[PDB]
Amino acid sequence: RAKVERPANVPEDRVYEIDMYALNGIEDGYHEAWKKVQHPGIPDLIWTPFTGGHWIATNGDTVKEVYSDPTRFSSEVIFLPKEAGEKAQMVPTKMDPPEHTPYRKALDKGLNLAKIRKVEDKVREVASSLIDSFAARGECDFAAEYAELFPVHVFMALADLPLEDIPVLSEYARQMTRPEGNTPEEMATDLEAGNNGFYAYVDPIIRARVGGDGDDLITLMVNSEINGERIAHDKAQGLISLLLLGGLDTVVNFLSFFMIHLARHPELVAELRSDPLKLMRGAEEMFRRFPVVSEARMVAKDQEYKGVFLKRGDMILLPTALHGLDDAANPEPWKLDFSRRSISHSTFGGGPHRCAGMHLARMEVIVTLEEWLKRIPEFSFKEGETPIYHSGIVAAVENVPLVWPI
Numbered sequence: 001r002a003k004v005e006r007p008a009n010v011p012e013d014r015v016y017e018i019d020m021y022a023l024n025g026i027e028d029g030y031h032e033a034w035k036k037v038q039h040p041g042i043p044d045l046i047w048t049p050f051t052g053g054h055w056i057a058t059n060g061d062t063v064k065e066v067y068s069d070p071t072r073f074s075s076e077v078i079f080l081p082k083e084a085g086e087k088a089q090m091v092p093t094k095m096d097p098p099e100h101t102p103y104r105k106a107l108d109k110g111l112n113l114a115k116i117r118k119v120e121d122k123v124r125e126v127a128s129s130l131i132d133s134f135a136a137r138g139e140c141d142f143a144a145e146y147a148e149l150f151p152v153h154v155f156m157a158l159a160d161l162p163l164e165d166i167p168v169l170s171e172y173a174r175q176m177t178r179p180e181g182n183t184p185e186e187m188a189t190d191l192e193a194g195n196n197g198f199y200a201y202v203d204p205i206i207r208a209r210v211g212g213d214g215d216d217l218i219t220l221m222v223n224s225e226i227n228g229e230r231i232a233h234d235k236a237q238g239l240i241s242l243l244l245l246g247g248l249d250t251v252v253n254f255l256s257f258f259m260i261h262l263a264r265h266p267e268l269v270a271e272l273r274s275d276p277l278k279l280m281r282g283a284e285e286m287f288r289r290f291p292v293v294s295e296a297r298m299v300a301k302d303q304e305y306k307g308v309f310l311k312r313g314d315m316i317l318l319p320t321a322l323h324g325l326d327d328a329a330n331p332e333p334w335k336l337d338f339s340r341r342s343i344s345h346s347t348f349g350g351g352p353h354r355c356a357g358m359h360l361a362r363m364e365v366i367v368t369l370e371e372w373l374k375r376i377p378e379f380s381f382k383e384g385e386t387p388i389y390h391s392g393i394v395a396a397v398e399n400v401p402l403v404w405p406i
């Protein structure tokens with residue numbers, strides 16, 4: 001709808017009509033729609049009048065570079081449109097170093113690789129138990145009956161929460177991650193129901209776990225220090241909330257993306273079923289091939305970049321799809337190749353905000369896939385059905401009916 005007028009720093013030949021929430025051809029798939037943007041010869045930085053007017057990085061080299069220099073490209077605003085964000089600070093996602101660092105250090109206590117190794121059995125239980133619920137059926141909607149459920153069940157185990165509380169957490173997760181609907185007033189109220197609901201829910205748990213010896217995410221966050229002192233109660237609520245939301249919409253959609261693909265590549269499934277080690281070693285490959293995030297950075301100071309003069313406060317969208325699927329970075333990028341030697345992507349971003357959850361994500365994906373093939377070694381996508389895609393900050397897909405012999 002709303003277009004802004006081309007600013008004086010945007011040359012006419014960098015103008016593309018791209019709506020990140022409604023990509024041309026999104027119905028035929030999210031990755032294909034982004035790739036359709038990245039035509040041969042496209043400049044490294046283009047600009048669109050939609051969503052407030054913003055630049056877009058169009059290949060792996062540019063995505064990487066904008067991601068990794070907070071002095072030039074700040075997380076002061078990371079969400080498009082620039083008015084959305086945007087008051088709520090969701091600490092530390094909008095901080096630059098050094099402010100960012102000790103908040104990230106608190107996140108890392110719950111998510112580091114050594115720590116994640118020790119939760120593998122709990123994640124495997126979530127996955128085998130979800131799958132058991134439907135393996136005997138010979139069909140399921142992968143998205144609604146596994147993907148949507150899995151992150152929340154993982155979070156309960158990692159944050160040591162009663163499984164009984166799934167419905168109330170699920171409701172607040174819906175509200176917090178995809179607010180609805182009719183007016184700006186309506187969406188704000190909806191989001192606040194999510195955010196403030198989750199806030200009341202975790203409050204006493206925070207207080208009970210101060211001084212505690214559990215190694216669940218909540219004890220670890222609330223007992224963290226920030227510049228020499230125990231973290232403020234509210235900051236800790238913010239980290240806990242971030243732990244919940246960081247691993248939710250990304251993982252929900254990512255899991256359906258790769259399952260859609262495996263559903264339509266039985267030979268590849270055969271290959272993985274036969275080489276468990278190749279399966280385990282190929283998480284990076286799946287992350288490259290199915291990136292889901294398009295956050296942004298704000299130009300931190302006036303500066304020349306990629307042939308244009310950028311102004312402080314301009315935004316650059318970083319569609320991470322355009323790194324993993326970039327053929328200048330990964331030859332024959334459409335192939336999910338478990339033997340690929342050099343797997344270049346920014347699916348977890350880059351620089352200091354590079355996904356704190358990336359070790360948990362790898363283990364969730366591998367464990368899901370192992371636990372799936374144990375029970376359901378052969379499977380396909382239901383005849384006469386198609387997935388339904390949306391683009392946005394996080395790529396969305398649903399309707400993943402899969403079927404298997406029984």
Ligand code: HEM
Pocket residue numbers: 075078092093104107242243244245246247248250251254291292293295296320346347348349350352353354355356357358360361
């Ligand atoms: C498919 C899986 C995932 C993908 C593709 C993904 C992607 C990302 C990306 C791109 C960022 C950087 C955002 C930016 O600053 O531009 C990020 C940050 C973050 N992610 Fe993930 N993520 C995934 C899974 C998870 C999981 C399982 C968790 C567990 C909670 C998680 C927690 C976080 C947190 C806390 C941050 C903020 C890091 C910081 O700002 O310093 N992520 N994620």
